[PDB]
Amino acid sequence: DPVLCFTQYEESSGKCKGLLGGGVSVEDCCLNTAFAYQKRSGGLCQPCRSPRWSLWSTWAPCSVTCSEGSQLRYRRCVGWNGQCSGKVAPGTLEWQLQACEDQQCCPEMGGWSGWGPWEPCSVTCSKGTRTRRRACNHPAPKCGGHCPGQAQESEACDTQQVC
C-alpha cells in the first residue's frame, strides 16, 4: 500500500517533518529506521522504529471547574511490525483517569434581591434627585464576584414649590 514517506520523525510532537515523496510502499520507506510514514495524510504519523510506547500527553482540562472532577491523558503505541508491551497492536490508545480540583470557590456571581421602597425627594424646594437602593444577597455572591449591573438607580423629582 503506497504511503507518504517522510525523512525525519520529530519526537515528543508526533509530527512528520521533512517530506521525501509519495506513493512508495511501507516496506521500502522503512528500510532506514530514522524515517517516518503517514497514510492518507489525515494524521497518525508513525516512525519506522520498532513498536515502543510514546510519551504520555499532558493532562486534559478538568471536567468541572468546581469541586472534584476527572481528567484524562492518552498514549499511542507508535511503531510498525511488532506488538507493544502487553500483546498490544500498534495504534491502540491507553488512558489514565485522575481526579482534579481547579478551585474551592463555587457560584461566585450573585443575583439581585427585592427592591427597597422609594425614598423621598432630596430637597423640599426647586428640584433634586430621587434614589432607590437594593441589596445583593439573594443569593449572596462568593469570592470576588459581583452582582451584574448597578447597585442603585437615580431619577429626578419635581416638587412644584417656589423657594
Binding site: 520507506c29 524515517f35 476527572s70 488512558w95 489514565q96
Partner: protein, 207 residues
C-alpha cells in the same frame, strides 16, 4: 527579453545513500535557454526530486530491555539463609533486543549483582502506615471508576549490619533486603494485612 525554454530532464545525481531510500535530483534548470533582461520565463514544471531505491536495509542499533526480576537470595552450601544473619547474592537480567543488519551493539553490562539478606516468608513486627495518596480511577473509561488509598502494615526491618567485607580486598559492599515477609501488627477496621477505602470518581469523561 530572451525567450527561455527547458533543457534536459537532466543528468542524474548519484543516489546519496548506501541504504534504504534517498532523494536524487535533476530537475530541469533553465540553463540551455536562459531568460535575459527580465522578459518571459520558462513555462511548465521544473520539479524533479526523484526517490532512488537501494535494495540494502540499513543497520539498526539495538536498545536495552527493562530490568528483570531479582533472583532468590541464597548462599552456596548454607541450606536456607532465610531470617538469619547470612549475607548472600542475587542476580538480575536484561536483554539487548533489536540489533539487525550489522548494527551497533548494546553498550553496558547485561547482569546486575548485589548482596542481599533473605527475608522471604519471615514473620516480622510491623506498624500501620498513614493514608497513602489517592490512586487513579480504575477501570478508566469503563463502568464506574473508583479511587483507592490504603494503610498497609509495613514491616519493621531488623537492625543488621548494612555492609559486608570481602575476602580478597578490604573494600566493603552494600547489603540490601529482599523478600516478601509476613508482617505482624494489630488490626485496624477488621483487617490484618491492609485496610483500604474506595471512593467513586466524579464527572468521568468520554474517551
Amino acid at each position: 527579453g530572451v525567450a527561455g525554454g527547458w533543457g534536459p530532464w537532466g543528468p542524474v545525481s548519484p543516489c546519496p545513500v548506501t541504504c534504504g531510500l534517498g532523494q536524487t535530483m535533476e530537475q530541469r534548470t533553465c540553463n540551455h535557454p536562459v531568460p535575459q533582461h527580465g522578459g518571459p520565463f520558462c513555462a511548465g514544471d521544473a520539479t524533479r526530486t526523484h526517490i532512488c531505491n537501494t535494495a540494502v536495509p540499513c543497520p539498526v542499533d539495538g536498545e536495552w530491555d527493562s530490568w528483570g526480576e531479582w533472583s532468590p537470595c541464597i548462599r552456596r552450601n548454607m541450606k536456607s539463609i532465610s531470617c538469619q544473619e547470612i549475607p548472600g547474592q542475587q542476580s538480575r537480567g536484561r536483554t539487548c533486543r533489536g540489533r539487525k543488519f550489522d548494527g551497533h551493539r548494546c553498550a553496558g553490562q547485561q547482569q546486575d549483582i548485589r548482596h542481599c539478606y533473605s527475608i522471604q516468608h519471615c514473620p516480622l513486627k510491623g506498624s500501620w502506615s498513614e493514608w497513602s495518596t489517592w490512586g487513579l480511577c480504575m477501570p478508566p473509561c469503563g463502568p464506574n471508576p473508583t479511587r483507592a488509598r490504603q494503610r498497609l502494615c509495613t514491616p519493621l526491618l531488623p537492625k543488621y549490619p548494612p555492609t559486608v567485607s570481602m575476602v580478597e580486598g578490604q573494600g566493603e559492599k552494600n547489603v540490601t533486603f529482599w523478600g516478601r515477609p509476613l508482617p505482624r501488627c494489630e488490626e485496624l477496621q477488621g483487617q490484618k494485612l491492609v485496610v483500604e477505602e474506595k471512593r467513586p470518581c466524579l464527572h468521568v469523561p468520554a474517551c
